[PDB]
Amino acid sequence: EVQLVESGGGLVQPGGSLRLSCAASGFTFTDYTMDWVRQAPGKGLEWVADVNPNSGGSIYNQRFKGRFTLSVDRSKNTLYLQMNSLRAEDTAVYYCARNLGPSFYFDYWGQGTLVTVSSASTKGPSVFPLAPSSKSTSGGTAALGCLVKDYFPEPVTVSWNSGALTSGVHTFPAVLQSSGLYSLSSVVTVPSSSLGTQTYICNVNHKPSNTKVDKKVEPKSC
């Protein structure tokens, strides 16, 4: 199978530096050229640069010349995007993509890696229970969840019962509060008959702050 895995994204201050990596596999790495395409939050797509893993020659998009440098290790099937003098406008998800034909359309893209350029400090989230009660019960269905509040930067991952519970789960897109910190809720609907019989724990992981929290959500009187 074909796969492109990016890594290296994260938080960096304006004028800071970062190196993104793209590990390729499942095809003759040197038979194609590789590119980076980015997408700023809620915006469109913007081509960044292309590099030929055989000659090391690279083509860049105008405004990135001077602060972005492409390189490749033809011994690990990896591509690198070195970034310096980062600007707030560089905040985006950077995708690695394979360029098959001579033309510039990409047939395979990695999942991307998030780069956040901000002077704000990293902060782990508080995790509060969204306790189920008669107020969150509708017949045979009851809702419960966890509020993941005041963290930075994105993203946080939330699972239920260590991934054992997936159906009925809704982890909402984070919202940026006035304080400059993110907040989101993850909820799950379950049959009412399972409330007092099943244990519900939300597992929150905020890699940027290297924080992992588990929170048991128990029914309450309300």
Binding site: W47, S103, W109, G112, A131, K135, L147
Partner: protein
Amino acid sequence: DIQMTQSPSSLSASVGDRVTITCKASQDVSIGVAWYQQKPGKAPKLLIYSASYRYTGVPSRFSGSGSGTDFTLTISSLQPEDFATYYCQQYYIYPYTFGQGTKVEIKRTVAAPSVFIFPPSDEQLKSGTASVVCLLNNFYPREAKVQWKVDNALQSGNSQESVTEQDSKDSTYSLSSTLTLSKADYEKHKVYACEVTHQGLSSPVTKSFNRGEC
């Protein structure tokens, strides 16, 4: 440089409907156009290249046409999983520009939201703040209004909401609205309620609780 302009910016179509999206190039680009599909939280996927070539493994319902300055992407029979943003791109002339994208949503039968409310936890209170959450679950259309009331007073500027991306299996949406107050302010009031209005509700629905009892 060459600009790629798509239309419409967004559209809603029913499952089984034929959908047509257009892309206009600011100048002749012969057949050097590609189309991509990008689902929420996923990386784009190549659908069409050379304007009319469906890429290997792409579902047959996807096809592209056009040449010169007018291009079109057609979904012969829209499927629930097709909810996504579709982008065109011209790739012969540097800097290989993409269109702004067209958001495609699935129009389904109206479904009223189930409404749930959650009082702030005692844990958060000892943190100095109180967040009250109102959940609107599995509804359609996306348009819904949530109004917070504290002791019957309409709130403004102290709440935020988030909507999930359209469900790829049943085409519904869910929404969370969070009202946040300092512990001091929260304890100065009794009744907390969220009123929900939606096309599927014949009359607004209100969920509430009394602070002292929760």
